[PDB]
Amino acid sequence: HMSGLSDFFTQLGQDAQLMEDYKQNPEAVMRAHGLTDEQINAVMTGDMEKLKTLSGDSSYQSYLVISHGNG
Amino acid sequence: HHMSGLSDFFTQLGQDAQLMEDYKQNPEAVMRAHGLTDEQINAVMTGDMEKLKTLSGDSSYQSYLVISHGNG
Amino acid sequence: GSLVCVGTGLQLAGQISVLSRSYIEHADIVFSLLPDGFSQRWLTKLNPNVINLQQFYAQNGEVKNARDTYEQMVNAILDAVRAGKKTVCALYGHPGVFACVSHMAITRAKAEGFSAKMEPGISAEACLWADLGIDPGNSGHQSFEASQFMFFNHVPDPTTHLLLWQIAIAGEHTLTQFHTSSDRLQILVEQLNQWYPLDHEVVIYEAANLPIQAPRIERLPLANLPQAHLMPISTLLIPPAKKLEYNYAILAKLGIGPEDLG
Amino acid sequence: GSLVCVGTGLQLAGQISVLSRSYIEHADIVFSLLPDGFSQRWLTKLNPNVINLQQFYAQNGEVKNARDTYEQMVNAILDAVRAGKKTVCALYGHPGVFACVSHMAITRAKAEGFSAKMEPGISAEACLWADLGIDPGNSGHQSFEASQFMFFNHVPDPTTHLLLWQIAIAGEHTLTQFHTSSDRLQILVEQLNQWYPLDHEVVIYEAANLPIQAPRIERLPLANLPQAHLMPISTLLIPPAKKLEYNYAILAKLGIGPEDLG
Ligand SMILES: Nc1ncnc2c1ncn2[C@@H]1O[C@H](CSCC[C@H](N)C(=O)O)[C@@H](O)[C@H]1O
Ligand SMILES: Nc1ncnc2c1ncn2[C@@H]1O[C@H](CSCC[C@H](N)C(=O)O)[C@@H](O)[C@H]1O
């Protein structure tokens, strides 16, 4: 399910022609890239797992504090 | 020929990390290996290619900022 | 071996340099620090031999220093280099912009006499200028870490476009959790209110990581910041509060009259 | 028609984003402001349908309103768009960093109801951090156009990494024509001396434009800057002159002291 989305998102972010065709008709362009009705819907509504991973904000913030707090 | 050969080569070299690693190992050998003449290799090795006609439009940009904040 | 640290930009797949993409394809081993699974899947298809560096962040049941977190990451990268491997680190955005792991690894690799370099990438501020149609050179530009701006003395030039990075965790500390993030942001607003009106429009910016989503460009008065939902990927833009004024002292030296400035 | 402004970075062919390269490939027509023949040749082979905007710069001497130059560039771009062409405007580095043409063209295209956007690129800022292994986030970062710093009132934060762009033409004006350029940089040096001592080490930086050349990273005392040989591509880096000091007032509001930082 997410393996097909991932491969379609990679092409879409690289191809300027696909980016334009997608803008004009996103539903029809996703059908033509072999994407299920579940997958189309999830993209159109925005209701789709973002797969966000642990950001290093707190580690970078803390490191900066520890660096200039040693003087 | 001279300028076309240098442009094609530079373009390839700027795009390919494999080629760029080899060029740092043996600059003469890699250039010689890509059909560049000794005259082309010479222009590169301790020669020109830099300090050659450029136009970065800094004057027109600095003037634009001055008159757009000049409030006159 | 060797070390090349590269940025993949913020957008999936399309925002990397042709050269940086080339470095990853041909790398013997890749150490990744990417923000989501889509970009992790994309990297792995480029080069299968990927070691994911976020295993080195504190996991469930652990508390870990930034020092030990980074030391462990650098050590892992340097082990592959020590083993004679053509090693590439793949960070999101620009590997040397508001990130220290790559700088640290490159410093250590050179010290041990290995060849190590950083390849610039497209950072969040680079995305911001494009998405908000703002020129940082127009009236100048300042970037500060939001917490550094609170803990240390940074005096901003309010003629400039000011970026406060990592705005979500502004003033965060295991000893300041008696304050809510809203409470800390209220303290930051009091501080900014020294140069910026409480009704001064600021922008919460979040560059898109996927090509199917628009960026977050939320405009709101400075006073409403404490009630904003902020993400780890939020950057705060504070446009100029003041028009540029002529520098009459330096014009006088140069012999220019203000009326002669177009 | 549509408009997309892209940047090619500073390094020939390899520093352009994969997606920015594709927009050029597929464009019906490309308007270029590339600085040199090598990048012009590379663009040409990607897409032969190129129009050079460099023509619109003052040609018969030097008395043209910069607003008129840019007005004509924007007009030439919009004429291709108005004719229903997939228009792409290719700039060096980042199309929107210390440049106004792309923002202007995109503003006027939007205002005329055309699809217009800017793709971020790798700027001279971004190359500097990588080449000098400096993190703008470490103690903060400030960017000013050198001449804007002299003619207008900017306050530098000497705890930050301060960049003066277009350093070569610092103080250039029709009224300063007969100034010797060392005279102009000497005034800038005196001005900067309010915050930076004269023996303070500064860096003249020039990112490489070709893969066969290493960057210029010239360290020298601020005092020697007027004697320096400077290029249109020169950027001046002024590292911090001061350690970060604790913001005691904000620390007390948060309920922590300096001893808690570290
Ligand atoms: N998608 C995004 N939109 C806006 N800012 C972002 C962002 N992703 C990261 N950032 C900024 O970067 C901080 C993390 S530090 C890492 C930044 C990264 N090296 C870069 O070049 O952008 C965040 O707290 C935020 O301020
Ligand atoms: N090769 C280079 N190395 C260092 N700075 C450079 C440079 N090319 C341009 N610059 C800087 O940029 C100024 C021109 S304004 C154009 C900047 C371009 N849009 C960018 O993203 O970088 C120069 O005066 C200088 O300050």
Residue numbers in the entry:
A (entry chain B): 0 to 70
B (entry chain D): -1 to 70
C (entry chain A), D (entry chain C): 2 to 263
Quote the study's own text.
Mutation of SonM-R67A produced an inactive enzyme, that when co-crystallized with SonA and SAH, was at once unable to maintain normal contacts with the top clamp, while still binding the cofactor in a manner that allowed the bottom lock to close. The resulting SonM-R67A—SonA-0Me—SAH crystal structure complex thus revealed our only structural data of an unmethylated SonA core peptide. In this structure, the bottom lock (the π–π sandwich stacking between SonM-W166 and SonM-F99) is closed, concomitant to the binding of SAH, whereas the top lock is open due to the SonM-R67A mutation. In fact, the structure captures an intermediate conformation between the observed closed conformations (e.g., apo or SAH-bound wt structures) and the open conformation of the SonM—SonA-BBD heterodimer. Interestingly, the core peptide is bound in the active site of SonM as an α-helix (3.5 turns). Comparison between the wt SonM—SonA-2Me—SAH and the SonM-R67A—SonA-0Me—SAH complexes highlights the extent of the change and reveals that unwinding of the BBD’s helix 5 appears necessary to allow the longer section of the core peptide (SonA 53–71 of SonM-R67A—SonA-0Me—SAH vs. SonA 62–71 of wt) to enter the active site in the form of an α-helix. In contrast to all previously described structures, the SonM-R67A—SonA-0Me—SAH structure is not a post-reaction complex.
The α-N-methyltransferase SonM from Shewanella oneidensis MR-1 iteratively methylates its substrate SonA at two residues, SonA-L63 and SonA-I65, in an N-to-C terminal fashion on the core peptide. Complexes of SonM and SonA form dimers of heterodimers. A five helical bundle at the N-terminus of SonA, now referred to as the borosin binding domain (BBD; 1–53), serves as the SonA leader peptide and is homologous to a portion of the fused clasp region of OphMA.
